[PDB]
């Protein structure tokens, strides 16, 4: 009820204080975990963007379909026998 | 009483648990900034490899080998919205 | 007289719960050491046959008995043996009865003509004998893109179905180029560009196409829309 119960309490609260506000503590966990969360989320979009361009490059050499889309979308070239139509507003 | 001595060891093993996962997360966050930097360098190099392959003088050279022909205005049907 | 009969009454009520407890304790030892052989399948089952669950359980070996058979090992074996099981939960009870709850995958389309996709993008496989009765759109794409192609199908389909078109197949490349297959084998060769804007161009240009198609007596083979405000049309003869 005395210092046998008060000294055991002042150490627990210094332990609770060092748990929340402390090196590698709870607040350090929450802050770092939020960073790791947003990082891999952003890196996921970046890797998706790079893998898509890698596929375009992998098809521009040793492949024709990605080259043929550029041959039509950017140079308006059509294959022989294809009736070309055009839309105007 | 000494029942708080139980609560001390409970919070002690809580601290070492948090300090381990945080130390494990900071090592992962440092790995992600290296991955982001490695992704951008790969992204920049890929764009430069696209300009070389997506060159119109190169595209027209291989598309004509694919038996294609430039857009001919007479053989062009027009439709109005 | 009272305590004399009370003690005798005490022993009688005592003796009768002992021997009766000796009976029910024997009624359980001869029951808790029998391999359970009653199973009940709760849940709406459309692909799982009753023999499917049976042969997949006894594939582990001897059935075991109560208090010696693990739940997490049975529900796991079901998930690998039957790839069309979304949720499984096996339960036991004091007698020889095995409650097994099943939740199946509802296919919305086919995935690379081998597996299938549900409405939430989950991928799964089913033997072809049990789904040949279903007409399903055939989706293609890279390995992990199961849900991404499904978003494209529901968006491009509702635009085509709005003008009474049936999107039979929808394929996406790893570079995110699109090839659509409609009814009667007409191919829409979209590209990495504005697929939503190029598809709306086709439903507006279509009535002009079939006119010259029947004028020259030709069937539409493909329609390449890898342009801007334009489209190249291929032709083919009819049988």
Residue numbers in the entry:
A (entry chain B): 1 to 89
B (entry chain L): 39 to 119
C (entry chain Q): 22 to 260
The authors write:
This complex regulates the transglycosylation and transpeptidation activities of the FtsW-FtsI complex and PBP1b via coordination with FtsN, the trigger for the onset of constriction. A core complex at the heart of this machinery is composed of three type-II bitopic membrane proteins, the Filamentous temperature-sensitive proteins B, L and Q (FtsB, FtsL, FtsQ). For a long time, the FtsBLQ complex was believed to act as a non-enzymatic scaffold for the assembly of the divisome, but recent studies revealed it to be a positive regulator of the FtsWI complex and a negative regulator of the bi-functional PG synthase PBP1b.
The crystal structure of the FtsBLQ complex was determined at 3.1 Å resolution by molecular replacement using the partial structure of the complex as the input model, which contains the periplasmic domain of FtsQ and the C-terminal region of FtsB (PDB: 5Z2W18). The remaining atoms (~40%) were manually built, including three fully resolved transmembrane (TM) helices. The other branch comes from FtsQ that adopts a rod-like shape, with two globular periplasmic domains arranged linearly and connected to the TM helix α1 in a slightly bent manner. The crossing point of the two branches, however, is not at the very tip but somewhere in the middle of the continuous FtsBL coiled coil, forming an included angle of ~37°, where an interface between FtsB and FtsQ is revealed. In Site I, a heterotrimeric β-sheet is revealed for the first time in the FtsBLQ complex, involving three C-terminal β-strands, FtsLE115–V118, FtsBE83–P88, FtsQS250–W256. The tightly bent short helix of FtsB-α3 is sandwiched by the short helix of FtsL-α2 and the β domain of FtsQ, forming an extensive hydrogen-bond/electrostatic interaction network which involves the FtsB-FtsQ interface near the C-terminus of the coiled coil. Therein, FtsBE56 serves as an interaction hot spot, bringing together the β8-β9 and β10-α6 linkers of FtsQ, the α3 helix of FtsB, the α2 helix of FtsL, and the C-terminal region of the coiled coil.
